[PDB]
Structure formats: structure tokens, C-alpha cells
Amino acid sequence: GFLVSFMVDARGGSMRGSRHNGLRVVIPPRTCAAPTRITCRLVKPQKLSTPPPLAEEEGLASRIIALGPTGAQFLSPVIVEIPHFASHGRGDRELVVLRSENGSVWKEHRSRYGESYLDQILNGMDEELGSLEELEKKRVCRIITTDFPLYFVIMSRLCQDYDIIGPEGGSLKSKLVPLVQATFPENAVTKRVKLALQAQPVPDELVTKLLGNQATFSPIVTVEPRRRKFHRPIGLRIPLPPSWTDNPRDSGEGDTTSLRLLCSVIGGTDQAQWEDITGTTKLVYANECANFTTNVSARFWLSDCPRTAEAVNFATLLYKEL
Numbered sequence: 001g002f003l004v005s006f007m008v009d010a011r012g013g014s015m016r017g018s019r020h021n022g023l024r025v026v027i028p029p030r031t032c033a034a035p036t037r038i039t040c041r042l043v044k045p046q047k048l049s050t051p052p053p054l055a056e057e058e059g060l061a062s063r064i065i066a067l068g069p070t071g072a073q074f075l076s077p078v079i080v081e082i083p084h085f086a087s088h089g090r091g092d093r094e095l096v097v098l099r100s101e102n103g104s105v106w107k108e109h110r111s112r113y114g115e116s117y118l119d120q121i122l123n124g125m126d127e128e129l130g131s132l133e134e135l136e137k138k139r140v141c142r143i144i145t146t147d148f149p150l151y152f153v154i155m156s157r158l159c160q161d162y163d164i165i166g167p168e169g170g171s172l173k174s175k176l177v178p179l180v181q182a183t184f185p186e187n188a189v190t191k192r193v194k195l196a197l198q199a200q201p202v203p204d205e206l207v208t209k210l211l212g213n214q215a216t217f218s219p220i221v222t223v224e225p226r227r228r229k230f231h232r233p234i235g236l237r238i239p240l241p242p243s244w245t246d247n248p249r250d251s252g253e254g255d256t257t258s259l260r261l262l263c264s265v266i267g268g269t270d271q272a273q274w275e276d277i278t279g280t281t282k283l284v285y286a287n288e289c290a291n292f293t294t295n296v297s298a299r300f301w302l303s304d305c306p307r308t309a310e311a312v313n314f315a316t317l318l319y320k321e322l
């Protein structure tokens with residue numbers, strides 16, 4: 001049953017599984033003080049008596065893996081790479097590492113020192129680890145752990161992050177994209193409520209592949225949940241498309257401007273129906289960002305798009321592939 005099985009000691013070592021399973025276990029120097037037999041196997045979900053429970057839009061995105069010896073404690077983190085088979089990109093849904101100590105309860109896996117610290121974690125090892133970006137394209141998740149639980153598995157779910165804003169007001173920023181901000185004035189909401197400001201970056205390489213040089217784009221910014229009215233106008237700040245930061249084609253105000261503000265109001269997980277709302281609200285430019293207001297939660301999307309009549313068509317082609 002073992003996809004990987006090898007001896008390692010204080011000097012560390014690694015092993016890949018067959019190209020059909022894509023597992024990789026990397027045990028850095030100094031993590032394993034005594035000689036130990038590192039193994040990994042797949043676990044059929046039928047054999048679990050209590051499989052991970054799943055809400056409506058949650059699913060397992062990888063094989064369940066049992067790393068051996070179970071309960072192995074390491075002196076500093078080790079690395080496991082596992083392919084995933086999620087049917088989506090990084091918009092409304094996220095991938096998370098789950099673990100089960102004995103197969104009965106499933107909880108999110110914690111790592112105190114993650115991707116930022118990879119160079120330290122390798123402890124001078126002569127191996128390469130790909131970047132997040134390369135891992136994303138190859139559809140591989142990297143697990144950083146100081147121990148082997150009975151099971152690990154990757155889960156797809158709706159993004160769980162949120163902040164609470166009340167009638168006193170406040171601001172939200174995004175986890176991933178730093179300049180994306182929303183400002184809620186004093187009576188925007190009547191009571192204390194969960195909100196997210198969800199910024200999805202748009203990679204140049206994908207825009208270039210699908211659209212060439214016909215347009216660039218800002219990140220997509222969604223105020224969640226959608227289908228809510230605000231009682232005061234909420235202030236949004238979105239970073240400009242890269243080609244506008246560099247040199248704007250025009251003043252970017254009123255109606256014929258090639259800087260288009262797109263909006264989608266519909267509900268649904270990774271659903272959008274884009275409308276060009278350029279010059280129905282006023283945009284103010286500063287610190288490489290556009291600033292405008294909305295009375296409704298929605299998706300917003302800026303595009304520097306000279307052929308202005310094609311902006312919605314381009315956004316649609318692009319969004320389907322994000």
C-alpha cells in the first residue's frame with residue numbers, strides 16, 4: 001500500500017511517489033534526530049467510519065493521506081506536497097489543510113511558521129522547493145507540519161474569513177491584496193454583521209494568454225455577502241490596472257475613457273454577470289488606486305480597455321478562466 005517508504009536520519013532526505021500520485025515528502029536536516037522509516041499511503045474514504053463532514057459547497061480536493069510512523073514528532077517542520085483536484089480557482093472558494101488525530105474529528109491544520117519561513121525550514125538542505133506560484137500552476141498543495149497525525153486531507157470550501165462592522169462604522173481590508181480597502185461610514189449597517197472584502201489578483205500571464213495586449217485589469221474586489229443594501233454609501237478603494245498606473249491613456253473621467261469600471265451584482269459561488277457602469281459614479285484617483293462609492297454589495301473590476309465596447313466581453317472570457 002505504501003506510495004513512499006524510505007529511511008532518513010539527522011542528515012535528512014526526501015522521496016517522491018510515482019508520477020501518478022505526485023506525493024513528495026521532504027524531511028530536512030536536523031528534524032529527525034534518530035534513524036526513522038518515513039512512509040505515506042492513500043486512504044479510501046469508505047474505510048473512514050467518520051469521514052470529514054461537509055457543508056453544501058464543501059468537498060475533498062485531494063486524496064486522504066496517512067503519514068508514517070503515525071504520531072511522529074519532528075524537531076522542526078517537515079514538508080509534504082500533495083496534488084489536488086479542485087474544480088475551481090481562487091475566488092469565492094479556498095483550499096485548506098485538514099487533519100484528524102484518530103479518524104473521528106477533523107480540524108484545520110495549524111502551522112506557526114509557514115511559507116514565509118521556507119528557507120529557514122530547509123535547514124541548509126540541498127533540495128529545491130518550488131514557489132507558491134509554481135505550485136498553484138501544477139495544482140499541488142504544500143503541507144508544513146511538525147508532526148504526523150493519522151490523516152491529512154485538502155478541503156475545498158467557501159472562504160471563511162470575515163470581519164465584524166457595526167453601526168459605529170469601520171474599515172475592511174483584504175488578506176491577499178494590500179491597497180484594497182472598503183470604508184463604512186457611521187450608519188451603513190443597522191446592526192453588527194459579518195463582512196468580507198475579497199480581492200482576487202489577476203495574473204498577467206493569463207490575461208496575456210487569453211486577451212494579448214488588448215486590456216489589463218485590476219484585482220476583482222467583492223463585498224460579501226452580495227445582495228445587501230447599505231443605508232449609507234460605502235467607500236471602495238481598488239488598485240488601478242497596471243497599464244494605467246504606468247501612464248494613463250486619458251484623464252479617466254466621464255464616459256469615453258478607456259478605464260472602465262465593471263460591476264456584477266448577482267449571487268452565486270463564482271458567478272458573475274458583468275455590466276459596465278463607467279460614468280454612473282465618480283472615480284477619484286490617488287496612490288495608484290481608484291476611489292468610488294456603492295450602496296450595494298457586489299463585485300467590482302477595473303479594466304484599462306481601449307476598445308471600450310468589448311470590455312464586458314473580455315471580462316467575461318477572462319472571469320470564466322480565473
Ligand code: NA
Nearest residue numbers: 090091093094
Ligand atoms: Na480563495
